[PDB]
Amino acid sequence: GSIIEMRDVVKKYDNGTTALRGVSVSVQPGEFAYIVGPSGAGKSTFIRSLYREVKIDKGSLSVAGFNLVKIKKKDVPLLRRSVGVVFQDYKLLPKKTVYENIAYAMEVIGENRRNIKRRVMEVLDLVGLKHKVRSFPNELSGGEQQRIAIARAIVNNPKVLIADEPTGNLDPDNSWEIMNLLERINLQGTTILMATHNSQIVNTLRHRVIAIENGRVVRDESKGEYGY
Ligand SMILES: Nc1ncnc2c1ncn2[C@@H]1O[C@H](COP(=O)(O)OP(=O)(O)O)[C@@H](O)[C@H]1O
Ligand SMILES: Nc1ncnc2c1ncn2[C@@H]1O[C@H](COP(=O)(O)OP(=O)(O)O)[C@@H](O)[C@H]1O
16 A cells, blocks of 8 residues: 555646646655656645645645545644655754754654653664764754654654755765665665756666656656656
């Protein structure tokens, strides 16, 4: 069974621009897929629809057992605990330590504090930065910040991780390091969809490629080339 099932999705913004014009995409647990296409094709709109940051107008969309047409605002946090999200600009909170930035994504459950700490240390070890637990984001390189943000994204052990240009603000060396981390997370079973403009990454680390142009899927292929 699918972990993401999108059918005939249409999205028109308030000013009238139709950003998705009938997109259908099916993703199985454990897949790694790149989302590629020219500026304005609708990649960001597609990614945002997967964690309900944008609401679809027509079609259907299910993610991790959540019906994103039906889900109420009050339940989006629950969805966010099954879908981790990674951003091009990392979006750490600059006044919080590394520990606080990661712990913030874990829901408080009565006590929870000691359990939260063990899990924060687990994901820090997964990304190789346990020695930064008390650091602030400014003390970290861009690559280190994105590794911390990825630790935050997986802190609830989600089955899906969505990334919008996760290496777009990183230089080449750090871009490859972040790809290695994402691939390691994927090999453990997590489904990963990531939008990207990095032709060298897509052409080298071959995965499923979903190409969008003018709001429609034009190509969907195993181990595909970047094609742009
Ligand atoms: N015409 C547009 N084309 C592309 N992106 C847009 C457009 N209008 C708004 N945006 C996006 O939305 C952001 C601003 O959101 P906006 O609709 O102005 O809401 P608000 O001002 O209430 O926060 C922009 O930074 C951009 O990312
Ligand atoms: N908030 C917005 N309001 C109006 N138009 C928008 C908004 N955000 C994006 N668009 C437009 O919708 C289309 C798709 O944008 P986007 O999903 O960001 O594409 P991509 O990520 O492929 O560059 C573009 O024409 C863009 O200008």
